[PDB]
Amino acid sequence: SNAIAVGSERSADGKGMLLANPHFPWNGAMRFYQMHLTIPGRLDVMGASLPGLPVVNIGFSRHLAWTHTVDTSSHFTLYRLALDPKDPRRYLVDGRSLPLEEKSVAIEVRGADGKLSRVEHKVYQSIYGPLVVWPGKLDWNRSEAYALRDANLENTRVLQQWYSINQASDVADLRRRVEALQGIPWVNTLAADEQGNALYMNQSVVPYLKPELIPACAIPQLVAEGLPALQGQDSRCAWSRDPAAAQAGITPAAQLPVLLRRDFVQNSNDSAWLTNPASPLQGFSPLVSQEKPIGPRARYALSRLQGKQPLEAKTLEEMVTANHVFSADQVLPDLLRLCRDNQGEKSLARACAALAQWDRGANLDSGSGFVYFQRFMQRFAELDGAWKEPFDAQRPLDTPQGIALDRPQVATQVRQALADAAAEVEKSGIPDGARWGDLQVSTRGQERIAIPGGDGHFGVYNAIQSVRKGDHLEVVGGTSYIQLVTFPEEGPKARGLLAFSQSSDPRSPHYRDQTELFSRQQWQTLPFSDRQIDADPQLQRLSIRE
Amino acid sequence: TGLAADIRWTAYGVPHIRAKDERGLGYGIGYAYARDNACLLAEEIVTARGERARYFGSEGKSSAELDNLPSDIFYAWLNQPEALQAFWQAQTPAVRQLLEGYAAGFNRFLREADGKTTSCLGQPWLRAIATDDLLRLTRRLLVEGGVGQFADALVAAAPPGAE
Ligand SMILES: C=CCNc1ncnc2ccc(Br)cc12
């Protein structure tokens, strides 16, 4: 997901602005749906929600717009259990052997004969939660096992939380309402209001451990790879209690990252750290936020946002619709240099031609250079010390950069990577002169619609995830509900689309109408005021009761 | 009863629901959502009820790409009666009313559906919904950043043998 909130100090109009570009599945239980909700006099909010939820999850109101991105905070902890040496169904806490609890569930299964048979399954539980097995990593042997404590299992406040957000007046009110209830499960919140405040909150439900407990309570080997894991044989490694937290064992609101500014805040699924580089967020629990290198999407956004020039709504829209493959900026200049150094090499000819002609985009008409680039990057990622400038913590926005071609081993390995990548591209059935839009599609009935955008891991702000299906790449997730909100005098001006359209049902008039528009990158008014709604020539009305 | 909503649709089938209270508001939302997505909600409710294997057998998967039986074990565990009851009891009057309205609105559409916008008309899994079903869906999303990511791992957790 991406989000950018602009305040009075940077917006062209001196008021707030929000770009909401969540990246979510195109199908299933997290498929966004547009709606506008009004209880006249006390609730008036519009945006998108998820299946089965009677509140708006990302949206806007008279003076406020807000959105969400997936945060990097932990929302559970694993607990490594020390098993009773005499009984692997018992475990030790403070040297005392405790029995696992057993909860059986019964599931009906339809057989080949159409009849139902009953399957009984035993779920083993510790004081922390259910046991979990990842074969070869988190085993259950005679020495150890792993249990999982999920912080959101006790979060009964989630629905009330978004209903409250729906009623929020401005950025300050939004912040109060979220900090008071702490019902957000696993997302950041970014918002802007008419007055020109820009807010970032890493305000979610996060297991709490007091700072001094972490060194002894962490599992060293598991935290390196970023699994939240704790010593389950020590009662002192229970989540810490603080009466200020809305829920026992979670992190109090005052301890979670927040940035309130009048210039900008941004997030593209990295930690709170570089929300705005002018004011880095640091000194938080490892369970909360760490200073890790930012992804190419955030790096791209910050490259466009930093400086002193005013930001227009058009600028934010075009950050999405440009489909710029930002990862190419770090690699392609030097990769093209290698190409010129290896002219007359038959294995590299097609790849080097495609790359040099490529517009560096994930546009519908973008050349096969994108495909060559993707396959190369997948191999480049596996190489050691191939960066000319490695990641520099002191230059976190401009590193890593370039290929260390002056290093002979790197030059050989990078050329080999390109040869191998070219071999893979040419091995697959890709027609001559075919473009990106000919490959990446969303199926609608028996028809296909060409979809612009590319994988977020290549720094395409308009992130689109696709999977090979037959002759095409079928879109499964990414850019979904788009909303761009400004606050002119008359009322909120919202513009966007629901990329996959309102209805998942092929019979609906609204199965592919916005998808046609998404293909052409033609965003539309999101009508909010009675005037805007009444101006729509497609306006239909139904009143219902029972 | 006491359920009423005014619904306006603008271009692209975007609903604008007006009501005097939470139950009416939910009523309008549930009806509008059902018009576009009844089959989707029915499928995801089957998943959150842990009934995929019952309707579809063990060879199929959920929309989250989990095998039907492991998915069912996970959701039956997650959405046990005691857990749903406790969750319901912790809900504010306003939220209870939103959910009551939603279920009633969805169900109204189902009663009247003639297939115009519903491809799964007649399927045994397309059924009237209850507020508990909406809680099942809520809890499924609630744990997406937690134990939900370990659904397969929970199912696979079994004590060692004599090895
Ligand atoms: C994108 C917004 C994320 N919002 C949510 N994420 C997980 N669980 C949820 C449960 C209920 C509601 Br309302 C909202 C939820």
Side-chain angles (χ1 to χ4, degrees), chain A residues 1-102 104-114 116-136 138-141 143-194 196-291 293-303 305-336 338-344 347-387 389-393 395-408 410-431 433-434 436-468 470 472-488 491-546, chain B residues 2-84 86-88 90-115 117-163:
Chain A
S1 295
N2 310 309
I4 303 162
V6 185
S8 59
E9 286 170 15
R10 288 295 305 285
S11 62
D13 64 2
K15 299 181 180 176
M17 179 169 45
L18 182 79
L19 172 74
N21 180 212
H23 300 154
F24 274 64
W26 277 37
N27 300 280
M30 298 185 287
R31 183 196 174 117
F32 278 113
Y33 180 79
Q34 293 182 270
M35 66 190 185
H36 171 201
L37 309 184
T38 308
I39 299 174
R42 68 178 180 90
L43 175 86
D44 196 17
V45 66
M46 180 171 182
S49 186
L50 304 172
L53 310 175
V55 291
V56 171
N57 266 210
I58 289 173
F60 67 98
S61 48
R62 186 68 184 81
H63 307 289
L64 180 66
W66 87 93
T67 189
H68 300 291
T69 62
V70 179
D71 66 43
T72 60
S73 309
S74 292
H75 304 287
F76 68 96
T77 64
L78 288 173
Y79 274 98
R80 178 175 71 178
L81 307 178
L83 301 179
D84 181 339
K86 289 189 295 300
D87 190 343
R89 291 174 203 204
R90 295 186 74 92
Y91 62 105
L92 310 169
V93 181
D94 298 352
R96 184 165 71 99
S97 178
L98 304 176
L100 290 167
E101 298 212 333
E102 301 166 12
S104 292
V105 294
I107 308 300
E108 294 300 324
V109 180
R110 182 191 176 89
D113 59 9
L116 299 175
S117 65
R118 176 182 161 114
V119 173
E120 294 190 26
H121 187 96
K122 192 173 290 180
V123 179
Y124 287 90
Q125 299 172 171
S126 69
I127 59 173
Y128 308 108
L131 275 60
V132 294
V133 164
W134 275 12
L138 311 175
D139 294 317
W140 182 350
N141 52 44
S143 167
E144 70 176 36
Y146 290 82
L148 192 160
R149 190 181 173 181
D150 181 313
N152 280 297
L153 280 175
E154 312 171 76
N155 176 8
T156 57
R157 306 170 305 287
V158 62
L159 295 166
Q160 181 53 59
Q161 184 66 95
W162 268 282
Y163 192 45
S164 176
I165 289 168
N166 284 191
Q167 295 170 79
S169 57
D170 61 7
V171 153
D173 193 46
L174 175 57
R175 182 180 180 177
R176 291 194 298 271
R177 288 171 174 275
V178 172
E179 290 180 357
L181 199 54
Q182 299 191 266
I184 299 180
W186 41 259
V187 293
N188 292 304
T189 302
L190 291 85
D193 62 16
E194 186 187 351
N197 300 282
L199 175 69
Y200 165 89
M201 293 190 291
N202 187 3
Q203 280 290 343
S204 54
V205 173
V206 176
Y208 183 44
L209 268 173
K210 281 164 185 180
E212 63 272 17
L213 290 172
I214 299 162
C217 286
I219 311 292
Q221 50 269 63
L222 296 172
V223 293
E225 66 184 81
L227 266 173
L230 301 176
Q231 310 271 350
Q233 80 284 27
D234 192 334
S235 66
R236 293 169 292 191
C237 297
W239 301 350
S240 297
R241 291 179 174 272
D242 184 323
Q247 181 184 310
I250 82 166
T251 302
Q255 295 187 39
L256 294 170
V258 173
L259 206 58
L260 177 65
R261 286 180 72 88
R262 285 190 168 270
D263 56 351
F264 76 85
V265 288
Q266 64 78 37
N267 184 265
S268 286
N269 308 126
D270 306 291
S271 74
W273 185 30
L274 301 174
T275 298
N276 188 320
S279 193
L281 290 160
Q282 304 182 2
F284 294 96
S285 172
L287 295 166
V288 170
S289 183
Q290 292 172 37
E291 304 175 23
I294 54 172
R297 280 181 290 121
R299 196 171 158 187
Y300 169 77
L302 289 172
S303 81
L305 292 171
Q306 286 195 308
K308 286 145 199 294
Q309 292 315 293
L311 298 160
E312 286 169 4
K314 179 189 179 175
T315 313
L316 300 187
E317 171 173 340
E318 288 181 347
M319 284 175 72
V320 181
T321 62
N323 296 301
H324 186 61
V325 185
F326 184 72
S327 293
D329 286 23
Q330 289 92 63
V331 168
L332 187 69
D334 287 349
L335 186 59
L336 291 170
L338 176 148
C339 278
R340 291 191 294 272
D341 285 346
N342 289 278
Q343 295 179 242
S347 67
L348 303 172
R350 290 178 66 177
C352 288
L355 292 164
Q357 293 154 29
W358 178 42
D359 67 355
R360 296 170 289 145
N363 303 294
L364 292 191
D365 284 341
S366 284
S368 69
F370 186 33
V371 180
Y372 283 103
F373 179 77
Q374 293 178 73
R375 301 292 165 88
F376 169 84
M377 283 308 287
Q378 286 159 3
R379 286 160 179 89
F380 186 79
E382 296 288 294
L383 310 178
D384 294 303
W387 291 116
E389 308 179 74
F391 173 74
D392 189 356
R395 296 174 70 235
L397 320 176
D398 297 288
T399 55
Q401 175 74 39
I403 304 168
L405 291 172
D406 60 344
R407 208 172 284 150
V410 174
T412 304
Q413 283 177 22
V414 171
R415 179 176 55 188
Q416 191 56 54
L418 184 57
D420 295 346
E424 193 191 336
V425 173
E426 289 144 31
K427 194 181 177 179
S428 66
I430 308 298
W436 179 240
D438 300 316
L439 183 56
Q440 184 170 258
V441 302
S442 185
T443 300
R444 291 286 180 281
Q446 287 298 117
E447 300 287 303
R448 295 161 165 93
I449 299 166
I451 304 295
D455 200 285
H457 293 105
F458 308 122
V460 194
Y461 214 58
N462 179 29
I464 296 290
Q465 180 193 353
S466 58
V467 297
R468 173 52 74 92
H472 60 268
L473 289 176
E474 183 71 30
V475 173
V476 294
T479 292
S480 50
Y481 175 55
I482 303 166
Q483 69 160 44
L484 173 58
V485 183
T486 54
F487 299 98
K493 179 172 170 175
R495 176 168 167 83
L497 281 175
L498 186 65
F500 36 74
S501 307
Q502 280 287 78
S503 175
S504 63
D505 199 297
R507 291 179 179 193
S508 168
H510 312 297
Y511 174 58
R512 55 173 280 159
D513 56 354
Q514 300 194 66
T515 311
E516 291 165 359
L517 291 175
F518 184 72
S519 181
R520 302 194 287 271
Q521 306 201 116
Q522 291 167 344
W523 298 10
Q524 306 294 324
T525 298
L526 312 176
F528 179 72
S529 68
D530 282 344
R531 182 175 295 274
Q532 288 176 306
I533 293 158
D534 200 53
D536 195 326
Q538 284 303 122
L539 179 62
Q540 287 169 21
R541 189 179 174 191
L542 174 66
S543 296
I544 52 169
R545 68 154 293 266
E546 74 184 55
Chain B
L3 295 149
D6 183 81
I7 312 166
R8 291 177 294 178
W9 288 270
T10 50
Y12 321 119
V14 177
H16 304 258
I17 300 96
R18 279 183 299 194
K20 78 178 174 67
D21 53 25
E22 283 81 3
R23 67 169 30 241
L25 190 71
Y27 194 60
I29 297 166
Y31 182 88
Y33 190 73
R35 188 177 85 152
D36 297 314
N37 288 294
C39 299
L40 179 48
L41 204 75
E43 277 271 359
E44 302 307 338
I45 287 166
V46 165
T47 301
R49 289 174 61 88
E51 289 169 352
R52 298 210 62 76
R54 184 200 156 92
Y55 289 106
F56 307 118
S58 63
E59 283 187 21
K61 291 178 173 74
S62 70
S63 61
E65 303 299 331
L66 299 191
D67 284 4
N68 284 351
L69 180 51
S71 182
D72 288 349
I73 288 156
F74 176 75
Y75 289 108
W77 174 84
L78 179 69
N79 291 324
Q80 289 173 64
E82 295 88 343
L84 295 184
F87 196 92
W88 182 246
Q91 299 314 296
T92 65
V95 165
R96 291 184 202 205
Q97 289 154 29
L98 285 167
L99 298 168
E100 284 167 7
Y102 189 110
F106 189 91
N107 292 345
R108 190 213 173 105
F109 181 84
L110 285 193
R111 284 199 300 278
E112 304 174 347
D114 72 0
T117 61
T118 311
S119 294
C120 62
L121 199 87
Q123 294 298 329
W125 48 265
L126 182 67
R127 299 167 60 104
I129 71 172
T131 52
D132 275 355
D133 293 322
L134 302 179
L135 304 185
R136 287 174 179 102
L137 295 174
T138 289
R139 292 175 60 79
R140 174 165 171 210
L141 297 167
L142 196 48
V143 302
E144 165 74 13
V147 71
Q149 292 303 315
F150 291 76
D152 288 318
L154 179 152
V155 172
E163 59 269 16

